[PDB]
């Protein structure tokens, strides 16, 4: 209980402190112009050059990568959606290859709809 | 140099985290029998104000990781052991299969002409065995 | 094939009437 | 009959949920400006005892769904609108593309011999237009 | 605040009540002998035969399906793992087709390891 | 099962229209 | 970048052994 | 190709020494 609360506070301090580090933020803002993957690996190599593996070091890398993926996704929603849809559709085509009667019924339904819409 | 700067910043941030020994005394004081409960209660208090900083999420990830390792250390759970055993055995089956179909270690690197080669692979192996099989024991 | 035409016309009827209800 | 039994049970369970009007007055009283804050605070209280029943998770799913619909109803957010618009436009592009490559509605169902055909597709369309274009207006 | 708490309690009542419904539980236990997908769709058709769509009805179906997937996964971990691994590997093979030097180094490393292990 | 199919398709259609109008 | 590669492979190897021994 | 043999031997050395440290 009390210990739980204490831990809660300590961890909150840490998170709030990483996300409100102003200068790291300026760095992160221009972390890389249109080439994030390479920058991430460069930073990774830089930090683990000492040879001292640490879970703490892993967490920071995780944080940086999340930010990168976030900004990229927000800016590439068209691309993302398009590509996902394409994958799904291609699979369906090849793989999808009483059934017949249901197909006929659905066809009729769709036909009527488009006609009414054009009208 | 900008990459250098960022890297130093990040490493300072992480190492402060792993050297915070108060935090380690608090991760190592939790009951072993009920870790999932404690994890879920901590997350609840952490997101009470509703604020959802991603830095907060990473702290929870750190807590969860440490808890898992402590528990897995005393006892690899039975199904974990099984799943792990099976995955290791599946890897032995596919990998050894091809590695045993392309030829073997020596047959593998023959793609690039000139060493690496069998003569070398066999010499190195012999040396290792010669040194490991007898010298170490005696 | 009267059966199949019937099924298709049923689909058309279905659609038309559904749309009618929704618009009304 | 066992399937029948199960189905009745499930439907009673769900309809009691949608007819619980106290619950609906409480989902419709939340501030529209801060939905995620209230959602995250409710989940926190719900999982305070640590108990993680899957029935509890489904209730949260119900709460989240209702909240989303209320908000989306007043205003389809701009990026939602864009994403939706784009997905609709992508579907128009691929679907119309093939549906316009295999031939069209009539060309589509020709896979199965005997009606459905084109003469029928054109007669039905004409009837629809004839009835919709003029009769409805006048 | 208070309203939040009230909602919390109401929703808890519901969940605890669905999961502790003893007879539904017996039903769910033998819901189906080795053929869950078909039973799920049968139940779906049964419930939505009235024509009254309701989000509440959807939630119950979701609950049933979760239980089904749960029991199946627990009982088919070997199969699951194997198939996932297979997919991943097949993709890697075809797709994976200085690089060379790193490959040589890793090869050397692996060779030594197996030898030491056999020893 | 014809009752089932009809019901399902009609539902999809109604859902489509509602969302479209909301947009 | 040779320092990088060596470090990385060695790490993987050490991790493997630790888990194996724990098992 | 002496270079490549050298790289391979370096890998072998690496592995051997790593395992040695871990066992010791």
Largest interface: A-B, 40 and 41 residues
At CATH level 3, the topology of chain A is Apoptosis Regulator Bcl-x
Structural class of chain A, by secondary structure, is mainly alpha
Instruction: Identify the quaternary structure here.
Output: homooctamer
Tally the helices of chain A: what do you get?
Answer: 6
How many domains make up the 3D coordinates of chain A? 1
Instruction: Identify the CATH architecture of chain A.
Output: Orthogonal Bundle
H-E string of chain A: HHHHHH
Give the N-to-C terminal Cα separation of chain A.
67 Å
Strand runs of chain A, count = 0
Largest sheet of chain A: none
SS strand fraction of chain A:
under 5%
Shape of chain A: elongated
Q: Give the % helix of chain A.
A: over 70%
The level 1 CATH classification of chain A is: Mainly Alpha
Rg of chain A, please?
Answer: 25 Å
CATH superfamily of chain A: Blc2-like
PDB class: apoptosis
Keywords: Pore forming Bax proteins, apoptosis
Assembly: octameric
Entry title: Overall reconstruction of the Bax line
